[PDB]
Structure formats: C-alpha cells, structure tokens
Assembly symmetry: D2
C-alpha cells in the first residue's frame, strides 16, 4: 500500500525479476523492476558516495555513485514526481541481505528539499550518527552506534554482516516534496556508504527512498526487495 520512489545501489543480480546480469544502480518508481539501470563496479570494503538530484522543471531523477579512485556510475530517468508521490513524504535509507550478505554501513547522509513559488526549505546533514538519534526513525535491524555510523543491516559483535536482514532510517520530520503552485520543487540527497563482504558474492544493496509519511518495512521485503516493496511486480 506504500508509494515508493527509490535509487537502488543493487550489489546482487536477480535476473528473473528484471535485474541486469551485473551489480547496478537503478531508479525505482513504485516497483523494484527499475525503470532505468547502469552497470556499477561495487568496490568491496571502500567508502562510496551516492548523489541523487531531481527538479520539477527538468523532471529528471538523476543518481551518480563514485569511489575515491574516481570510478563512477550514473543513471537518469524522465519522470514527473508530482504524478507519483504524495505531497507530504518521509525520506530514508534502506538496505537488505538474503542468502548472501554485506555490511550496509552509512557514514554520512544529507538532504535538501525546496519549494520556490511566486521559498520553503528543509535541509539536514549527518556526518556522524549518535547512539540515540532522536531525529531518525529506525525500522527493522537498522542501528546507530558509538562508531558514529548507521548500520542499516545487522552486523555480528565480530564485525561480520548477517543474512536475511532488513533495516531503514527515515528522517523524523515529514517533507513537503511538491506543491501544485511551486514554480520549482527540487531535492538533492547525498550519502557515503561502506559495503564490505567476505561472501562468494555481496548482497543485496542500499536504497535512498521517498515514501508516504507512515511508510514501514513491507513483510518479507528482505533480500532482493531491498526493504522497499512487498513483491517483485
């Protein structure tokens, strides 16, 4: 029943549900079957940066993911989010493991939404997460720690990631993501992540998403559904 717009960093090819035959970044409009994808070389144990950009003028949801060595993947998709999202939303991060696993560690997260009419703005930045993060809604296995990081999916004491895990972090305050009379409705999101795995293959990935205010983890949305969708339709 949730409405989802997401950028997925998808570490695991699930070819039978329309994934390409490689790790990819994807734009997901109300379906895990990405509307557009690009090949992504996920660098095990390295800190990546994801950037997400939209404005209501160009009506183009863009994402780019890069690592320090400079290797980057970009994906863009033409979509009017006025026709997709509710006016009011929550913004969040989601990650899953299944049969295979990885750390889904968030080191930092920033977001900006603006409505310019004829301005209303929300901006937050986390470069360190604290134990009792009162402006975050933690769902499922997602924890904030003393190490200053957001662990979306459960990690063992020994620092090793665990399978069949799902967790999300949503910003506490609802966001006014569009308003019919806004001349420009724009949002930007950036997060840094550390995906590390000793597994034969890492899985399943990390998503930035926008949803209805009351959005919660769909039941059985572990693994390939990235904690966003109740099925693969």
């Amino acid at each position: 029943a949730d409405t989802i717009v997401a950028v997925e960093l998808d570490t695991y090819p699930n070819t039978d549900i329309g994934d390409p035959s490689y790790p990819h970044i994807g734009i997901d409009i109300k379906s895990v079957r990405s509307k557009k994808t690009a090949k992504w070389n996920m660098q095990n144990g390295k800190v990546g940066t994801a950037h997400i950009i939209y404005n209501s003028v160009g009506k183009r949801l863009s994402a780019v993911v890069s690592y320090p060595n400079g290797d980057s993947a970009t994906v863009s998709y033409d979509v009017d989010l006025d026709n997709v999202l509710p006016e009011w939303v929550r913004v969040g991060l989601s990650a899953s493991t299944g049969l295979y696993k990885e750390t889904n560690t968030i080191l930092s997260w920033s977001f900006t939404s603006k409505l310019k009419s004829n301005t209303n703005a929300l901006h937050f930045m986390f470069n360190q997460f604290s134990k009792d993060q009162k402006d975050l809604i933690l769902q499922g296995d997602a924890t904030t720690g003393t190490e200053g990081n957001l662990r979306l999916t459960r990690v063992s004491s020994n620092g090793s990631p665990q399978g069949s895990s799902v967790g999300r972090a949503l910003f506490y305050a609802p966001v006014h993501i569009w308003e019919s009379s806004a001349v420009v409705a724009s949002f930007e999101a950036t997060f840094t992540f550390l995906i590390k795995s000793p597994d034969s293959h890492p899985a399943d990935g990390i998503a930035f998403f926008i949803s209805n205010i009351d959005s919660s983890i769909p039941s059985g949305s572990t693994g390939r559904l990235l904690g966003l969708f109740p099925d693969a339709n």
Copy 2:
C-alpha cells in the same frame, strides 16, 4: 517540569512580575522574569522581523527586533546553554492574549542548528504556512490557514483577535542543540510577525523558545506567562 530558553517580544508591562514599565524584548532562561530586557516600540499593524543568534564559543544569546522604517531593539545575555538545555530539544513559537489582546500572526520562520566537531546540521524555512502543515506541532489555539500565515492565538471570523488565548508551533523533528564534543554548537532563528490590536493596550506578546522534546503548554500559562511557564517565578 519543562526546561525553557526563550526570546520574548513582550507587548504588555506586568511590572509586579519584574517586567519594565514599557513593551520590551527579553531573554528568558527557565523563568518569565527575563535575565535581560531592552525597550521595544511595537508598531501596531506593521510586519516586524525578529533575529535570534547563539554560538557555544561566545556563549552569548542575542536577539534583535526591527520594522521596515528601521527602528530596532537589541538584547544580549552571556549564558552557557550546555548548562541549561537538554542535548535534544524542540524549537517553537508561542504567543498569548489575556485581559488585553492582539493578532499574534507569523508570516515566516527559519531556523539553523549546526554542530562542528573534530558537521551535523538542521535548517528549515517557512515563508508560507499551509492548512495541513505536517512538519509543525500546533498546540492550543495556534492554526495555519490558506492566507499562508501561522495564527498563534485565536482570531475571530471578522479578523479581530480574542482574549485569554494561547497557541504554539514546534518544528516536528527534535534538534541536537549541543553535544559535549562539538567545537562549535550554533543556532540562528528568524521570524516575521504582524501584531495588530484595536485594544486600549496590546497584549501579551510572541516568543521564540527551545524546550525538552515533549514540551506542552503549561496549564494557566495564558496572558503574561506567554504559553511558556506554569508560574511567574
């Protein structure tokens, strides 16, 4: 039981509870008995701008209130808010009427909090308020409308303000206002207001305040207590 730090725009002299013999702006640390005040010429029916500034280095809570014609009042008070406030807070606007009354109309409100260590940031801006303002907590008589304004205290259909009124607006998300390891903890707040009264004297005023997350209007905090304090101590 609430902990309150406020800047009060006090339109009504209550001399028996330590108000000066004129309308004033005041810095209130856990008491309506302002720690410091300055004379303020409130201009009936005109749009004022209040600016509030603090940083943990100078440890000086400053406020200035001005009108378009340029007449301004300033008040500063040396205080370590690390020693006053809880780590996590909500920020809000409050206004009251009593025996005398005024419009307590907010046309715009912006806030920025930052912690710089060895950055975490929250920024919001409302230049228009909407009917269902999902990122605001409205308490008491406070309403948001189609006129794009926040009415802290009850106004009649005919546009006239009503007595014995109290309302507040708090931003939905808790704010991390200080952190022991922050090198610089700073906040800025700005709001524009229209106080108008056909009364013999306007009352009672408008406050920007910071409180515990779960802060609510103290019972009988109408009139001279500005919806912040349960008594005049």
Copy 3:
C-alpha cells in the same frame, strides 16, 4: 571570440533570425539562435522571477520564468556544458533595447555553483543593489542606484526607458563551473526583474549568461543580440 551560454527572456520577435512569432524564453548555446524556446506572456510593469538550473549528471539546462499571478513558461535543453564552457567563467545578467524599448530592472539576483568530487562552492545573493557595488562588474549602460535596483539598460530621469541601450552586470569573482574529476558539477541562478514599456511593443529582453572571465559587450550587440553576441549566426 567570447563563449556564451545564456537563458534569454526575449520580449521581441525577430522572426528573420530564428525567433518564434511571440515573446519567448530561450536556451542559447554560443548562438542567439536559441537551441530551444517556449512561448512567454511577459506581463508589462509586473515583477517576474527567472530560475536557471543545470547539473552535470542529468546534463539538462532548465529555465522557468513566472509572475505572482502564477503564469509561468519553462524550457529545457540536453547539453554537456563540459564540452561548451571553459573551466573558469564569469556569470552575469545582460539586457538590450533597440528601435523599441523597456525598463530592464533587476530587483534581486542569486547564484550557487558546486563541484562535488571523491566540495568547492560559490554562492552570492543580492536582494538589494547599492550605488558602489564593488562585487559587480558593470558594462555599457548598466547602473546600480539608491532605489536598491540594477538598471541593465539606460532609463531617463523621468523614469522612462531609452532605445539602442546595452548593459551587463558580471559577478567580480571567476567561477569554477566544471572540473573533469567532479562527480557532480551543478549551478542554480534566480533573478527577479521588472520590464515596463509605454512602447507599441517592448524590446529586447534580459539574459542570464555564463562566459569566459574576460567577456565584454560585443560591438553592435544592442537590440536583438541582447549584449551577448557580435552577430545573429
């Protein structure tokens, strides 16, 4: 010899140089012959707002122009500005009159450029212009005044605009608009304008532009060339 990327608010149809048969907004890549245009209802004597948005991910230069009554025109054009502009630029506003004329009054101008790698930023905002505006380069007839406005084209003492006029304002500091290793290079510009004319038709329009550092008004670039181009090619 200058390299120009501009958004033109074109009040006058010059049909013989590829203008449409109506006032329009246009994206100009190294030619006054706009790569893309949209019909624009210019509202005589009213304050308009222009917004310009680009990012190096979507590679889409977008502009929207609106007035308070809400009537707006939008134009978008897919272009890699890494392949058009020099790395370092100046940003500016330009306006012209010819055989016909108008006020080309700028009431406010803001700009933001960012490079995010694996951040460098420039932001300025003018909501009032002063007599000796030391962070602006004024070219041709462009003046700043006590009325707090930038007059791009010459106005008489009696407040009436004059024909065959050209003036520009460039921000003093060069801008690093792209860098080969930037993951995201983005810029946003906003300005408010008042075009007013008692003429049979207004002319010629206002442009936001990006150029080489040493860009100057091309000789004979009054009227339909908007002070940007030395010819209509």
Copy 4:
C-alpha cells in the same frame, strides 16, 4: 596604511612585543599586539581546524582552534567592527616564518558573510585548491598546487619549510562586511591547516584576516608580524 582585523594562530612567543610566554591564538584589531589571547597547544604535523565567528548584534569576535584528539583553545573579544573596518573588504589567510620555520599548509577554507536588513550574502568553500586558482589573489610566497593544498609560506622540493617567508591568499571578490542599515551583519570563517616543523621551535603562525580591498603584504612583515602589519606597534 592598511586596516587589519585578524585571528592569529601564533606558534612563536615574541615576549618583547606583548606575546604571552607560550604559543597562543589572538584577536588582532589594527595591531599585532593582540587585544586578547588564549594558550594554544599547537600539535606538530597534525591537521587543525580554526573557526571564526562575529555578528553585529553580540559584537563579539570569537575564534576556536581544535585538533582531532579534541584539545581546543578559544578566545573572544567585544568589538564593534562597524567602527574598525571599511564597509567593503577582502578576506584572506596569511602566514610567516622567520629565524624559525614551519609548513603553513591550508587544506580547506570556507567563509560566509550576510547582511539582513528591513538579505545580501557571500559564501565560498575550498576543500581542494587547484594549480590556477582564479578566485584567489596569491601574495608573496603563497602557492596552490596539485596536492590540492594552499602553501602560504615557501616549502622546498624535499617538502621541508623555509625561513624568512611570507604569503597570503585573499578571495577575489570584495565583501560588503557591514552596511549602516543592516539589522544583522554576521560572518563565519573556517579553515583546516597542517603546521609541521623539524625546527627547535616552530614559527611564526597563520592568520585569518579582513582588510581594505587593496591590502598587500607590508614590507618587512615576515616573522613575528605574520604578513599583516608593517611594525609591532
């Protein structure tokens, strides 16, 4: 003939010109004889962060310098900069060596100035410096490199710092630092630095400063004068 307001990170005690008997941070109003100082433990070879804060309401110039291990020094001084500085200024960084020496390496520098009336803003951020930094004015020995850093004072090929060196970096654009009608005139500056020395004692230090537009290195302002002052008065 220059007018100087500076925060000095002073690594070398020059006791005969009013330095305390230890490395210190200082607020300098038109004199190298700091109006106020605080003891500073400079950590050889470590990256420090300096923060500078002023607003025209509190009228308190504050500085804090810290290192990752959390050791920090703070100094505040009550001063009306409306009565000290010209309306228009340039902002910059300065460093010197003399008989003793150190690296005066700047890794990052950000600045924000705002005038709020009844807003004009300038903001820049350098987290990487490039070889041809067109928005910086380099004076004396100051160089920008491929290592992404600003070297205020001359360093040998072998990476060792050199004595009797002075260099400054000023932002290209003049800043409107105060305006008589501004309700709030505020500025913030942050820079990160790496001072390293194999010398018996490091010298001489790094300063953030504000000056007249046409400010240049005073002759013989190497060593204890930090490239800011022509004498020790």
